[PDB]
Amino acid sequence: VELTLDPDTANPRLILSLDLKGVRLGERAQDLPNHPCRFDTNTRVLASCGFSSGRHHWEVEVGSKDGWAFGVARESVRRKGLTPFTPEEGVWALQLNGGQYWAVTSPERSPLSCGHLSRVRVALDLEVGAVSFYAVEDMRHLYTFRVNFQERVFPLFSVCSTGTYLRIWP
């Protein structure tokens, strides 16, 4: 029922928690098989469940320090080589970097004056075409990407430095 991180997609430097809800960046690459679905360079992991229709919620507990980005990716997001982290590559995400919260628009990111984030509710609407993010304390709106999604969409998580984490909460 509830989402878990999919180890076969995870960049081999990531460490997934035993319960498959949490992700952080490790200090060494694990020796994992080089499956076509595995992100081999960018520090990403998908949930094991993707969505082709309907409306869906999940929540993400976020670290207080820099290094994370999360949201959704189109299934065709490129897995191999160093790729941009942009809407054009099929990534729609929030990010904590430089001590600021961002919606990762392109070519320039959009800084969010949202105050401190602890947990975020993600609302994916494949019927109308939107993904929205809310801070759970008061459900204040963080950002909405309006996208005419044309394929299956997966929850996406990325952690590119040590000292922070993301965790699915349900």
């Binding site: 960018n42 520090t43 990403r44 290094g67 980005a69 982290f85 990010q95 970097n97």
Partner: peptide, 5 residues
């Protein structure tokens, strides 16, 4: 390290 996000 954001290049690898």
């Amino acid at each position: 390290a954001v290049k690898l996000q």
